[PDB]
Symmetry: D2
Subunit: 237 residues, 4 copies
């Protein structure tokens, strides 16, 4: 068997609650976000999808979600690997700004572009500014990381991790759990279902509902778009 691949997007963070652009800013989960993660773990267990290995980003809202999920699934003991390549998109100079206030100041057109352009990133964040990560030691091996990203950049930096590290696990039949972010999971779905640049821009992935991919020998999905474990909950839009 090619192993099952389970994707999970973390739930509500503190900055989600404040309605701020977060990006690589390392904020925590709200109480609700923590409760969602626990249920995530129940769903996984309820559908007989116990992971053999866990992949996360370097961001605590994904790492804690993963912890809580595995705790509820009774699989805390399994191996885990973490990579910046699973991080959320870097939001550049938007990091720390209010979304509502931003939409107003620049309008819906610039807003939507910033949020949803595939090829065009926001302005670069200022090095060593309050909400920049360029001085964080976790990014020293990449020279502090990018100053901004668009989804096309996420795709480019995510995919090497997937092919070089995770695919190997699936190939030998392991069930893989990936806990990460809207943009990095959108990047992976774009690759798995071989989606176009404009098709991927309309893709929404809901929080806290595990998404199961059943792959073939070629790492090709058996079911395009995968299968959510709670379709009606997924279905909130």
């Amino acid at each position: 068997n090619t192993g099952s691949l389970v994707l999970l997007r973390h739930g509500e963070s503190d900055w989600n609650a404040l309605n701020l652009f977060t990006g690589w800013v390392d904020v925590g989960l709200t109480d609700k976000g923590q409760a969602e993660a626990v249920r995530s773990g129940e769903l996984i267990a309820e559908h007989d999808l116990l992971p053999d290995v866990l992949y996360t980003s370097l961001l605590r809202r994904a790492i804690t979600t993963a912890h809580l999920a595995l705790d509820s699934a009774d699989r805390l003991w399994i191996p885990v690997r973490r990579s910046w390549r699973l991080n959320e998109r870097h939001y550049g100079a938007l990091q720390g700004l209010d979304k509502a206030e931003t939409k107003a100041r620049y309008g819906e057109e610039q807003f939507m572009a910033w949020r949803r352009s595939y090829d065009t990133p926001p302005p670069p964040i200022e090095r060593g500014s309050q909400f920049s990560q360029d001085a964080d030691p976790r990014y020293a091996d990449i020279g502090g990381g990018p100053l901004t990203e668009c989804l096309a950049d996420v795709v480019a930096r995510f995919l090497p991790y997937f092919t070089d590290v995770i695919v190997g696990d699936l190939r030998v039949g392991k069930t893989v759990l990936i806990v990460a972010h809207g943009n990095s999971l959108r990047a992976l779905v774009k690759h798995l279902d071989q989606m176009s640049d404009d098709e991927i821009v309309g893709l929404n992935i809901p929080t806290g509902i595990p998404l199961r991919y059943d792959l073939d020998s070629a790492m090709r999905p058996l079911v395009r778009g995968g299968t959510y474990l709670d379709p009606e909950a997924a279905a909130a839009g």
Copy 2:
């Protein structure tokens, strides 16, 4: 590189500590108070700028969650982690799941203290397949389901290969290593670091919640015999508090 700092951390109160039951490999959770201890452990590591570069744990949720909580308060959640059965608590054999007092009453003082601490005599073997046995748990599949009981000598034998072949090389290249584990496995490590006698380690008590820093030389010999607790006062009192 100059040799990395080694940090040892014993988890706090579990649900079975609270019910006074022998635990061993039974995979019980933490009490609210054991969780609070772990958060505090993290603060101490940070206030003493001992930020870890890598984490090692057992396969037991009370250590794993202790680790998560400490790294979160130390803001080092993102570091790599490795887990191994070789860091597990001593297996308590047929004592797993039984009340310590009730067991003391029935078997006697001397037998009770021999089981808990006798360096070379383990408790009686657990029944394969029984309610508090781990022998059929997949996580121990590659070791044939594991031992049915253990003495400290047993823990020392199965713990050290992991220390020398995995953790030491981290220390050698200068990484700050955090090990979050259990009473007997950490006592097994301390026995080895400080080259303690069988007789001496039986008396050693390691307090919960308080990180212990070892400063090692190039040959992995401690520069401070017995290491240094980040809260030496608490340490002395936790060393008492035990059980």
Copy 3:
């Protein structure tokens, strides 16, 4: 402090002897190529630079070079990791061709652009052809791999391996040996010395002579262009 980085480009292959474009074709070293690897090892040992870890490509001419070098340096026992990201540039449909046939097939203008461009790859090789690698199981996790590459493509797929794996070793003080290929090492030098797209394409890297890069905390060369270990 930061570890030393030692770079080694393998010596003569069987196809170099016939002047054939090789790319990912997995051809072996000539006997001269082998002897050059042995000497490479002697030079490393002669300069007291004993590696703590080895990185190679998936191609036998580098793998064997590394084996012979480490043998002669008496550091055979060290950990080794291999990656397609360290492979030679894929030469697309030129793989297996000599110049003549290539200028014949593709004209002199493209022969030139394909030789000196940074951003123009050769034509894609045909899938399942005799000198294609798309069916090799070693490339299964990347869907068989690319069917052609320009230097820019090599830079793009090389650097993730360098930052995410090799720089970590360097940061904790290890001496790192990389045994690879003209263009993969060219890509690395581009990064280390921050060279321009225009300047990198004709950068020369001699075979069989180790190249030592002393770096600072910031992974920046103390010496621009490194130091060749040689008489």
Copy 4:
């Protein structure tokens, strides 16, 4: 077809084998005869459709070079490799660097035989810092220089941890594993797999340069006790 195949290979003639010297951890190389054995072993592997997915060796060049030549012939040079002292030949203590005559001279005939086939009695410890001692070799730093002598019981004891915690996991996910090592370390492994007595394993011969195949069940139990050589006709010679 889920539990992977195990392929064991004992290197051929070393330069000290030619001088009839006790070698142990002394890191001598392969004779011309020895290399040819290696190359032929690789052809045998390929001829039997046994492509390795991963390679395990000792830290001793006679093994590592054997592995390289074998994989070269099988055209699997590119596969991942892991090396460990736990696959090393038995340490021969004070006998390292001695011939039979000089051994019988300073130690006597009575224990020469003892140290020959006693499961449990190691030769004398070698002098630390002496000419054929490895105690100061940096590759054994993490284990304090290593033991100063071994008996086969010792070898069994330090081998098995590596088998259960590293190699079995590969087998479990279906990989074909190639182990290239030495007489006493492969003996340790076969004693385990076929549950050989202490006294049984003393007279077990493993021929040099003939790959030994073990097919295993989920319990890591051989399907065929003793396994299957790839050149049966040559089993002893």
